[PDB]
């Protein structure tokens, strides 16, 4: 909070897709590449790159979803999230 950061975007409109990760992390990035080679419009925000109040407020968006607090966690339109590089899963839920 916010679902902002930086828009790798691209298009398809497939609803609101968010992704929280860490940048230092691979699965976090293979996550967002997948995002990306599904050519799907969604953002996402890498975490550990935060501001420290901006970073704060992103963990606790993350933890709503995901109380593990884990990343990757994929929000999908402010209902749905995706614990992890799933890709299948990530797949399904945006018609792949």
């Not at 599904?38 to 996402?44: A, H, I, R, S, T």
């Not at 975490?47 to 420290?52: A, G, S, Y």
């Not at 709503?64 to 884990?70: I, K, L, Q, T, Y």
């Given at each position: 909070?916010?679902?902002?950061?930086?828009?790798?975007?691209?298009?398809?409109?497939?609803?609101?897709?968010?992704?929280y990760?860490?940048?230092?992390?691979?699965?976090?990035?293979?996550?967002?590449?997948?995002?990306?080679?599904?050519?799907?419009?969604?953002?996402?925000v890498?975490?550990?790159?935060?501001?420290?109040?901006?970073?704060?407020?992103?963990?606790?968006?993350v933890?709503?979803?995901?109380?593990?607090?884990?990343?990757?966690t994929?929000?999908?339109?402010?209902?749905?999230?995706?614990?992890?590089?799933?890709?299948?899963?990530?797949?399904?839920?945006?018609?792949?």
């Amino acid at each position: 909070k916010d679902t902002d950061k930086g828009k790798h975007v691209s298009g398809i409109d497939r609803g609101k897709i968010v992704m929280y990760g860490l940048s230092t992390c691979v699965w976090c990035k293979k996550t967002k590449k997948l995002l990306t080679d599904l050519g799907v419009d969604f953002e996402y925000v890498f975490v550990d790159l935060l501001e420290e109040e901006e970073k704060s407020n992103a963990i606790k968006q993350v933890s709503r979803f995901n109380p593990s607090v884990s990343f990757p966690t994929t929000i999908l339109n402010d209902e749905k999230a995706i614990v992890g590089f799933k890709e299948k899963q990530i797949r399904e839920a945006l018609g792949f």
